[PDB]
């Protein structure tokens, strides 16, 4: 528990959506294995009912935690002013918002907020897609190469054992892809950085990008509790970790790389900071009370990775091979000590892979996972993890791209 006299005043939760069906199932994805991909019970890209339940289990945890620390009421529904949800436009994030409220405040008549037009990107989450700002294609190449520490064309050489493992789990040698190109998974698909003319769309092509997607899909199959996960081929924790290493690397390159991170993460970073009490300007969330205690932002793994890259936070998650798992969230807390001095603390809160698979109840006695995070740039951050707000404010204002602020 926190230091003597310390009081939790305000929380900002940046959460990934819950377990979802694969966003897409391409021809390449089908061709790299002779096995058939399992059918999901929802449309591609939608949160599953189980994904919603899992999220509500996390909302239950947050309720108990925020009651303990004095921020929410014991028993009683919270006032509507106390809790606010802003979700991205997608079905998966809106339903994540809704499921959070059902767990945080069961049978309370609360509702989420989101952009009015859901058929257009919300610039808070995707400023680049929404046309707020754009990147330079050449600077993207250099930044990504800098982040990998090596030419991207050689990336697969950093991940030979992981790729080989993905190859056996797929039975890639006996796949259609290989009867159409006659076979090694790494050699067949060298890494490359591809960017469109606009510099508005960037992707890692080749084996590490493809395997990142596949590995996440296997993790989601497990979290969904599907009868067969990767066709029975993942047996050990070591194999999970080795598969998901591809996915975390892909995210580091495509979303943590600071040049990319700041173009995509600036609006959220500014919004978070402002909710925490920074004197920095930010586009207001509609209908939010000055008296708001809990701001829950329902977004994506790319958002968390963006914020991570901007603030330089890294972590690994005990029992959870995905660094940005379904329902995992960055939880920013505003604390004041007894002299009234405000600090920021940041945790990565998540469900372990076993908590997802077992749909485990999350309570103070049987909690969600949680990792206390260092902010390297905050040189006056205390050993117990508090970052003075005045320092946190400066840090943010130096990390943002001014061209990507929401005007």
TrEMBL record:
<dbReference type="GO" id="GO:0030288">
    <property type="term" value="C:outer membrane-bounded periplasmic space"/>
</dbReference>
<dbReference type="InterPro" id="IPR029033">
    <property type="entry name" value="His_PPase_superfam"/>
</dbReference>
<dbReference type="Pfam" id="PF00328">
    <property type="entry name" value="His_Phos_2"/>
</dbReference>
<protein>
    <submittedName>
        <fullName>Histidine acid phosphatase</fullName>
    </submittedName>
</protein>
<dbReference type="GO" id="GO:0050308">
    <property type="term" value="F:sugar-phosphatase activity"/>
</dbReference>
<keyword id="KW-0732">Signal</keyword>
<comment type="similarity">
    <text>Belongs to the histidine acid phosphatase family.</text>
</comment>
<dbReference type="InterPro" id="IPR000560">
    <property type="entry name" value="His_Pase_clade-2"/>
</dbReference>
<dbReference type="InterPro" id="IPR033379">
    <property type="entry name" value="Acid_Pase_AS"/>
</dbReference>
<dbReference type="InterPro" id="IPR050645">
    <property type="entry name" value="Histidine_acid_phosphatase"/>
</dbReference>
<keyword id="KW-0378">Hydrolase</keyword>
